[PDB]
Each structure stands twice: as C-alpha cells, then as structure tokens.
Design a protein around this nucleic acid. Structure first.
Ligand SMILES: [Zn+2]
Lengths: 99, 213, 19, 134, 82, 58
RNA sequence: GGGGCAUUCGUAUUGCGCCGCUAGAGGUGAAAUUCUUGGACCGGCGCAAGACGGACCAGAGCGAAAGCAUUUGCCAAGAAUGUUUUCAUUAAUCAAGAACGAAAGUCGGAGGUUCGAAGACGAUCAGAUACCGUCGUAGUUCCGACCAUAAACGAUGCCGACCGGCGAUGCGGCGGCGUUAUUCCCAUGACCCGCCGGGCAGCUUCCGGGAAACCAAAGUCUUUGGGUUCCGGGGGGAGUAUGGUUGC
C-alpha cells in the first residue's frame, strides 16, 4: 500500500531530478529525496576555546566557523540516528524539531 | 649528520607603499652554494596576508596575495599578485532563500597588468517583507550582471595598479555596485570576491622601487 | 527465485537453443 | 636563530591536514615554500588503528612545537585541511587535539582558517552507484 | 450559500467577477479621449491599446503598448467617454 | 608534570557496564581551570584526583 | 535549468617539470596487496589533459514524454495573460501510418581525467567464485549510424460540465494607503493589502464514494447512459513453444 503521499521525496510537477552522493557511504541518491543537514559548527569546541583566547596575539578576535552541507541516503540517515521511524499519525507532521 | 637550518639566511619581507603596516615578517632561504643564488629562491615567492595585518584599522576577511619581484640586501621587495576572500565569510554570505549573482571580467590596466575580477552579490530581504523568498527574475539578474560588469570595467580600465589597489582597500567597487544596482533590485552584500593577475609586463626595477618609494 | 533472474536464465536458454 | 627583538613575535604557517586514517601537523614560513618541520601520528604511535587518534595528534603537535621553539618561531598561522576533493569535508578527530596541543606548548595563535579543497562539479567518487555496503 | 439571488447579484461583486464568467458579458476596457499639451485637436483611443498611436496634429506619441492597458505620455490628459 | 584537581560536580555514569563515571574537575595549580574527565571507582564532590596526563579529554 | 549552434569561466581530480624538509604514506572493524632515502606522503610556484557545473537549489520553473542549472551572443520555437482585432464550426478521441524516446548494448572514426562490468591479487570465511580493500580491459566523454526497452510511476488515458472552505506559492493582468532607490514631481523597480485567469502543490472537512488504505477525485454508480481510444477475466504452464515480421 501507499506508505507516503509524496513517495518519500519532493519532486512534484517535474520529470527527473539530478542525483547526488551520500556524504557517508557514497551511495547515488536523488537530490530531492536525500536528507540534507547544513551544520554550522564552531572551529573550536567551548571546552578548548579558553586555551586559544590567551595564546591568541589579537584581542577580541572572533573565532572562525565551518559551514558544511551533509547529504545522507535513507540507509545511512537511519543508521547514524539523525532521523528515526515515527507513528503513522506523527509522520504527516513535517515541522522540524525545536531546539 | 649536518643540520640544514644552520645554512639558512632570514630575509625581512616588506609590502609596497599602498599598505600602512610595511613589515610582514621573515622568510629563511638556503645560503648561496655558488651555482644558484639565494635571490632566485626568494624570486617567485607568494604571501597570502590578511588586510587587517597590512592596514591597522581595516577589516580582516579580504586576504591579499603579494608576489616577490626583487631582493635588495637582506630586504625582500613584493608587488600585488591577487586579492582572495576568506572561506568562513564566503560561506556565511550564501543563504537558502535569496538569489546569488556572480560576474567575472578580464580588464587590462593602463600601465599594462591584465586582471580577472570576480564580483559576487546577494538579493536583500526587505525590513517589512512577509514573503519568505527574495528571488530576482532572470532579466533583472542579467541587467544587474551587465551593470556590475560595466562598473568593474570602467573603474579598473582607466587607472593603474597604484590606484586600483587603493580602490580595492575599502572595496569602493562593491559600494558603488550596491548603490548603482539598488534601482533594479536591492543588493545585500556585494564584494569583489576574487582578483587574479593573468599577465605581467617585462620587469624593470625603477617602477618596483617607485611602488616602494 | 527473483523474476529478473528467471528472465536472464530464460534468455541464456533461448541463446543455446537457437544455436 | 633570526636576529629579532625579544618583544616582537616571529610568525610561521602551520598546515594541519586531519584525515580519518592519519593527522599531519606541518609548520612552514609565511610563504609555504620553505618548510620548518612536519610530524604525523605514524611517527608517534606504532599502531595503524591509532594513526589518526587524538593522542597521536597531541604528541605530534607537542613535538613540532618543541622543535619550533629552538628555531626562533613563537607564533603560527593555523590552516585546517580535511581530505576534501570528492571525499568528506569535515576534519578528522586529530584536528582539535593538535590545535589544543600547539596552543598549550606556548606557541601563539595567528589567523585560523579552513583550506579544505572544495570542488565545484567533480569527477565520480570512489564508491559505486549503490555505494559502500559496510 | 443556499440563498443567493443568482438573478440580481450586487454590482461590486459583478465587477470583481471575471469578464467572461459574469451573469451577462461586458468588457472591462473602455474608449477615452486624449488632450495633448502641444495641440488643440482631440483624438479617441482604446484603453488597452496595441499600437503606438500618433497625433497627426503635432506628430507626437500618445500611448505606449504594454502587457495590459496602454500607458499615456506625460502631459496628455485622458477622460472617460460615456 | 603530575598535577592534582578538585571535583565540583559528577556529570553522569558512563562505560559499557556503567563501571566508570564522568566528572568536571577544577585544577589546584590554577583556580579557574575546568576540564571533563572519566574516572574509575566511587567519587563525590570534594574528592581530589592525581592526573598523570592532564591534556586528554572525555 | 524548454531546444540547437557558437563562445567563455570555475574550483577540484590526475599526470608532469622545478624547489624545501624528510621516514614513513595509502587503506580498513582489524589487516594485507600497494607507492617509498634512485627520495614517497605533505607544503610552494607553473604547465597539460579530459570530465563535471558544488553551495545558491525550494514539495520552485519549463518541456509531449524521456529530460533540462557557469557567462555572453546568434537562430527558430512555446504556454499563460491582455484585447469592444480577425476566420465562423474549422471540433473531441483515435485501427493503419508517423516523430521523439533514460541507462545499458552493437558498428565505424576522435580522445582517454575520474570511476569501473570482465579479469588479476590482498583480506574475511567451514567454504566466498561475493560483501571490504589495491590495480584494471570494455565501457563512462564527443561526431556519424543503429537498438526502441525501464518500478519509462502519480503503479491513476484524453476532452467537457457540476460539486465545500482555508492560507501560501509561480507567470501575467487589474485596483489601492504607506516605506524606500533612480536627487525632487510624476514614472519605473523592491516591499505591503486585496482582486481576476491559467499552472506546481499543501492543510482541513460526515459533499460523496471505497473492501479498506485513502481520494476534492479514485465524488456526481442498482436514484445504474456527456463523448471516445487502449485493455483484464482464478493461480501456474508463460510472455514459454511455433509461425510471421524488424535488426549486423
Ligand atoms: Zn549512504
């Protein structure tokens, strides 16, 4: 039976979407379906920031950040536990988790 | 068994007259063995230095690539080779609900340096805008691209490196594009993303020394 | 067995039959 | 070595290439051409497992700092590098430990930046169409 | 719902509803007379017009062809006819 | 460089059979120096550890 | 991001020349095969090759469907909207007969960067003819011939009418306070609030259906007839046998 109305992807009123490569296991996945995780993480973790402050020659030097957009296939997205299965009612909810 | 670092001479490297902070730092090279001169080792040497390390009170995300041209008795003579933008800035600029506009142009300076200038721009979220997206239509983009191309052309065709660098220190090119392209579609951040030296003239010491004083 | 491999066996059998 | 005033900090450039198989802490001059000292996890630990371990990275950065003190360099410009290309963009586990170990040795921290080789429309990645099944 | 006089809809609702889907069809367009600033002769133009029209009186452009209604030149005053 | 460290708070219990415990320790030589460490055996607030390797993380 | 032809740029990958320091580097759950003091891996400068157009990139657009994202120019298409323009039934759907048709595949030419069927090894294993790793032929790319198939899917034929609401969104048009840029007045852009038509969709609903899952169509079906094409008749045998026809 039809599990997901959208067929677990975003392509509507469109023929074919170009494929991309899963950041983990290098699987070929369509761009629309792929789980996209755009992570903006500080170049140093808060635990190690203290040691950089004193050592730095510059005063009030704002620290750089890494911007990297990870693409996950459904096999790897579920195994890595970034996304897990939900109830048949809570599936239709497409609101991102609040933090 | 010999330590090579015993046979290394440290040469001080100075930036040309465009920048305030003259002293950049020290580079070591192997001593002249007779066959090959120490100057030849320092001749084709590049230096990617932040703008805030060249000018005292200027921003620190517009990195300047400086090539050595001559060596003058312990002191190294550098000239402009290119202008790069730092990664974190370039990554922090690109947002998911706005059109990015990129325009590259080849221009010949009057004194005879061939530059390739890449200028990038982003559409502005208005202050009272409810709509989620702020995209520009293909013609509006083409008009903006033509506008920033012809501005870059005009403003770097007429003058020479001496003046072009001084124009790029505050990024006056960008500010003028932001002001000019406001009417077609409001721009958010318009920087000169990249400047690359393509071709050089036949080297002479006189102009290189004039660039330093 | 798998239907795609039923079809591949059938084609291998048709190749040897005709020759 | 360099005849410089005690107050002024002599700068260098430290390239930190942090893969998942190994870590590279490599100090050079301002240009990059004239290298000073490079040490990798392989030289510290004799275990192919722990080539990339944070401990190996810490030891590598501690030894390269110890050598840099004796050549007159006091400050370093950090350049963090992941494998990049068609492979992963995230740095390996050694990066943070190595940077901490350089900062702890007494070496000053200059401009921090990522120099990961990001590709615009690259060639086929090493994995097949179905990808890596392990 | 359930009681509307399909026979006698209110004239503001009549005008809002599409020209073809009205109770009786009527065009949204109209005929207007133009008074050119540098001329005495009067001319009549269609509200949505398609050709750049010329006043042979002074030989000057009047209205411009657009996606919808024709934009009149600055100075030339338009007035509705009947 | 063998240095001592006070225990301010017990963060939680870790390890495959919860045999270890994760704690945040404030050093003795420096007053305001916090680091996260995993320690075997029973611990509480006030207990001082003798850290042989003071650079590693948990 | 409809199509063809031309032009240009981007970093990355790989190979090569030169320079610095050097003992390991690669890969894996763990290893080994493999490349290394005839100087690997790493860092700097420059040259070359072919591939691909990241992030922007969306339940967004365009196309009959396959499919279609670097810039600029040239050539001819096309929907929708706008119209007090014209022809005046010229239409709908379709045996025969046509155009196109992913990937792979077969012929000739060009070139071979990456990846990589076959094959050669190294691991794991009771065995592994596989999964994992190192290499690698055909192929992957371009020009000219074929081949006519995919879960070619919305598993849902096309044309036309009627039947509930709601907020967005894309293109065009229409009306209207107020912000801003082109100094200012209009007038164009960017916003903002409504309306109208045609599209991509979404949420809600005891309209009503259905075996239900669900569907504003898969509703207006025993209260059974708007028009028309293809097509199923318990499960295997079987998309097999034979015959015809198309193709190297
Ligand atoms: Zn995967």
């Amino acid at each position: 039976t039809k599990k997901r109305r959208n067929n677990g992807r975003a392509k509507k009123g469109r023929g074919h979407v170009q494929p991309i490569r899963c950041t983990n296991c290098a699987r070929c996945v369509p761009k629309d379906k792929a789980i996209k995780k755009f992570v903006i993480r500080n170049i140093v973790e808060a635990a190690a920031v203290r040691d950089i402050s004193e050592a730095s020659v510059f005063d009030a030097y704002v620290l750089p950040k890494l911007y990297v957009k990870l693409h996950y296939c459904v096999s790897c997205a579920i195994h890595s536990k970034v996304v897990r299965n939900r109830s048949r009612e809570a599936r239709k909810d497409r609101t991102p988790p609040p933090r | 068994v010999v330590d090579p670092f015993s046979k290394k001479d440290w040469y001080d490297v100075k930036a040309p007259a465009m920048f305030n902070i003259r002293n950049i730092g020290k580079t070591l090279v192997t001593r002249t063995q007779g066959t090959k001169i120490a100057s030849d080792g320092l001749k084709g040497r590049v230096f990617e230095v932040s703008l805030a390390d060249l000018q005292n009170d200027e921003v620190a995300f517009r990195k300047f690539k400086l090539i050595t041209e001559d060596v003058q008795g312990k002191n190294c003579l550098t000239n402009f080779h290119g202008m790069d933008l730092t990664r974190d800035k370039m990554c922090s600029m690109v947002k998911k609900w706005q059109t990015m506009i990129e325009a590259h142009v080849d221009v010949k300076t009057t004194d005879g340096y061939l530059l390739r200038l890449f200028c990038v721009g982003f559409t502005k979220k208005r202050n009272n805008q409810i709509r989620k997206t702020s995209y520009a239509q293909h013609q509006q983009v083409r008009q903006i691209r033509k506008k920033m191309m012809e501005i870059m052309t005009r403003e770097v065709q007429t003058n020479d490196l001496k003046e072009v660098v001084n124009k790029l220190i505050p990024d006056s090119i960008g500010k003028d594009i932001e002001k000019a392209c406001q009417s077609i579609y409001p721009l958010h951040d318009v920087f000169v993303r990249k400047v690359k030296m393509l071709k050089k003239p036949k080297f002479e010491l006189g102009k290189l020394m004039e660039l330093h004083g | 067995m798998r239907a795609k491999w039923r079809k591949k066996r059938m084609r291998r059998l048709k190749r040897k039959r005709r020759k | 070595g360099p005849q410089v005033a005690e107050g002024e900090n002599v700068f260098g450039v430290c390239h930190i290439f942090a893969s998942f198989n190994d870590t590279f802490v490599h100090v050079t001059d301002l240009s990059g051409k004239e290298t000073i000292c490079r040490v990798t996890g392989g030289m510290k630990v004799k275990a192919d497992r722990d080539e990339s371990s944070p401990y190996a990275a810490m030891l590598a950065a501690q030894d390269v700092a110890q050598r840099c003190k004796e050549l007159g360099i006091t400050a370093l410009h950090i350049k963090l590098r992941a494998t990049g290309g068609n492979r992963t963009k995230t740095p390996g586990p050694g990066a943070q430990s190595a940077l901490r170990a350089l900062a702890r040795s007494g070496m000053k921290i200059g401009r921090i930046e990522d120099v990961t080789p990001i590709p615009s429309d690259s060639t086929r990645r090493k994995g097949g169409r179905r990808g890596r099944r392990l | 719902p359930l009681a509307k006089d399909l026979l006698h809809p209110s004239p503001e609702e009549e005008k809002r509803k599409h020209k073809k889907k009205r109770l009786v069809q009527s065009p949204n367009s109209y005929f207007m007379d133009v008074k050119c600033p540098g001329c005495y002769k009067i001319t009549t133009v269609f509200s949505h017009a398609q050709t750049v029209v010329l006043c042979v009186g002074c030989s000057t452009v009047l209205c411009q062809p657009t996606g919808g209604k024709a934009r009149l030149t600055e100075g030339c005053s338009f007035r509705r006819k009947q | 460089p063998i240095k001592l460290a006070r225990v301010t708070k017990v963060l939680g219990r870790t390890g495959s059979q919860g045999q270890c415990t994760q704690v945040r320790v404030e050093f003795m030589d420096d007053t305001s120096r916090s680091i996260i460490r995993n320690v075997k055996g029973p611990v509480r607030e006030g207990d001082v550890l003798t850290l042989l390797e003071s650079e590693r993380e948990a």
